[PDB]
Amino acid sequence: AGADLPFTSVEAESATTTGTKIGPDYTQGTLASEASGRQAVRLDAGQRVEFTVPRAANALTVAYSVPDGQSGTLDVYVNGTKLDRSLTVTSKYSYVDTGWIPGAKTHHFYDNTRLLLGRDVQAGDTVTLQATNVQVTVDVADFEQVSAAAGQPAGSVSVTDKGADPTGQGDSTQAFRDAIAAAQGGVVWIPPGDYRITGPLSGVQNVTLQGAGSWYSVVHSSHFIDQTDSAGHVHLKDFAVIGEVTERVDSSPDNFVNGSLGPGSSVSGMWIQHVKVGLWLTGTNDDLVVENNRILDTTADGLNLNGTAKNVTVRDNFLRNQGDDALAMWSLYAPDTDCRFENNTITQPNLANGIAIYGGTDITVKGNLISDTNALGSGIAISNQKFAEPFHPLAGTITVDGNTLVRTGAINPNWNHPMGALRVDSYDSAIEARVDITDTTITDSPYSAFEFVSGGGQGHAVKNVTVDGAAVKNTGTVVVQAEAPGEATFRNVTATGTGAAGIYNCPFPSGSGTFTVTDGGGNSGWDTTWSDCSTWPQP
Ligand SMILES: [Ca+2]
C-alpha cells in the first residue's frame, strides 16, 4: 500500500542521538501526538541526531518543530564533515488555532524543511542534524534522489522571456499570464529560480506549465490559480508552489488551485506547501489526474473534490501535516462520480480524517497507506455527513480495497468516545450505496478497527456493508465498534492482539433498531463480544 515514492523516511527516534526522545503519546494537543510514530527527538543546542542513510539520495526533507515565536537553523553533516548550508527551521507556519471547529485544540506544531545536499550519499552513509541556535524537535527525515534540473523543451515559451523575475524580487504574475496567452496549445517553461506570484492566475486553459523540477523551479504564491471554469487541457508539471499561509481562514482562497482546471487536465511532479488547501476543486475537472505530487504543511485539506468531479484520479501522492482531511470528496452541488483516491501515502492530518468520502457515487479508495491520525476523524471515513446543502449522499458502489491504516483512530473530545481506524457513518441519512471493504490491513489502532456509526445520533441504518479480507493487529479496543442500527457481513477478518473484545454492538439511539453482524466465515481471533453495553471498552 501507498505511493510509489523516490524517497525513504527514517524516524528520528530510530536514529542515534544525543537528544531526548519524546512520546509515544496520543493525547490530543500534545507535541508527541502530531509526530510520525507518535515519537520525536528533542535537540537542545547540544545535540544531534545521526541518521543511517537508507538508500541513494542527494536531497533531504525534515519534519520538525521549534517553539512558537522562535526560528533558527539546523546544521547538516555528512560523514562527520559539516555541509556548507543548513536547514531553515521556523515556527512561522506552525501553531494554528481553529476555535470555530468544536473540539479542536491548537495544532499544526510541525513543519517540513528541505535541502539539496550538494552530494549524493548512499545507503550506510551518515547524515547528522546538529542543533546550534534553537531547540529543534526532529520527527522524521526523508532521503530522496532528485534528478538534475531538466532542460527547456523545444518550442516552449519561457516566463523569463516575458519578464518574470527568477530572483523572486518583482511580481511575476503578469509575466506568467503573458506566457500562458502566448503558449496556447503549447508549453510555458519555468526556468530554475524563485518567482513571486501574488496571483491569482485565471484563464488557465490549453497550456502546459512546466518547470525544471520541483526542487529547482519554485513559485512563491498563496493564491496561485483561482478560476471557476476552464476549457481544460491544463498540465501543471515539475515545479513547486510554496505559500506563506500561517492560519486557516475558511473564507479566503489561500490555495494552490482553487476551482476548475477543466477537462483533460493533470497535475504532476509538484511540491505544494504552506497553503491553506492544496487543491480545492469544484466544477468541471473531468478526467483530471493528480499524481506524483507532494502536499506538505497545509492549514486545511490537502485536496478536496468539492462536487461535480467526474472520473478524477488522485494517485501516488505524498501528504504530510494537513490541517484537516488529507484527501476528501464532498459531494455538494453535484455528486463526485467515478472518482478514485489510489496508492497515496498520508501521514499526520492534524484533525479529522486521512481520507474522507462525504457522499458521491461509485467512488474508489484503493491501496492507500494512512498513518497517525488524530481527534475528530478516522483513517478512512465513508460518510453521509452533509455539512451543507445541496448534498448528494453515497450512491452506487463504494469500493474500499487494499488500504493499510497504521495508528489511526482517536478519542473525539466532543463525546469522549472514540472514532475507529475505518468508519462507515450514516450521519444524515442511511447508507443506500453498497460499501465493499476488502483487503484492509489495520495495525496498532489506539481504539477500534472498524466502526459503524450514525454519528449525529439520528439512528440511520448502516447497511449494505461487506467487510471481506482483513489483517487486524494490535487493536486497542474492539475489532468492530457497532453503534448504528443496520447490518453488515464480515468474512476473512484475521485479528491478533485485540485489547478489549472482538465486537462492541450497542446501537444508539434507543428505539432505532438492532445491528446484525453476519459471520460470513473465515474470521479468527475476534470471536468475543463485549458483555456490557453500559460501559465502554478501554485500551
Ligand atoms: Ca517520529
Q: How far apart are the CA of 123 and the centre of ligand 1, in A? A: 20
DSSP 337: B
How far are the Cα atoms of 219, 238, 290, 467 from residue 198, in angstroms, in the given order?
Answer: 10, 20, 24, 48
Q: How far apart are the CA of 228 and the centre of ligand 1, in A? A: 40
Q: How far apart are the CA of 376 and the centre of ligand 1, in A? A: 21
Contact 292, 316 (CB under 8 A): yes
Question: What's the residue count for the chain?
Answer: 539
The torsion angles phi and psi of 176, rounded to 5 degrees, stand at: -65, -45
- Alpha-carbon gap, residue 377 to 409, rounded angstroms: 7
310 Cβ partners below 8 Å, 6+ apart? 284, 285, 286, 287, 336, 337, 338, 339
Q: How far apart are the CA of 420 and the centre of ligand 1, in A? A: 22
Q: How far apart are the CA of 252 and the centre of ligand 1, in A? A: 32
- Alpha-carbon gap, residue 335 to 200, rounded angstroms: 27
29 Cβ partners below 8 Å, 6+ apart? 105, 106, 107
Q: How far apart are the CA of 460 and the centre of ligand 1, in A? A: 39
Alpha helices by DSSP H, listed for 185-257, are: none
The x, y and z cell numbers of residue 319, run together, are 501528504
Q: How far apart are the CA of 51 and the centre of ligand 1, in A? A: 13
Amino acid at 303: L
- Alpha-carbon gap, residue 71 to 68, rounded angstroms: 8
Q: How far apart are the CA of 402 and the centre of ligand 1, in A? A: 25
Helix (H) or strand (E) holding 181: helix 173-182
Q: How far apart are the CA of 498 and the centre of ligand 1, in A? A: 25
- Alpha-carbon gap, residue 426 to 40, rounded angstroms: 37
Contact 142, 60 (CB under 8 A): yes
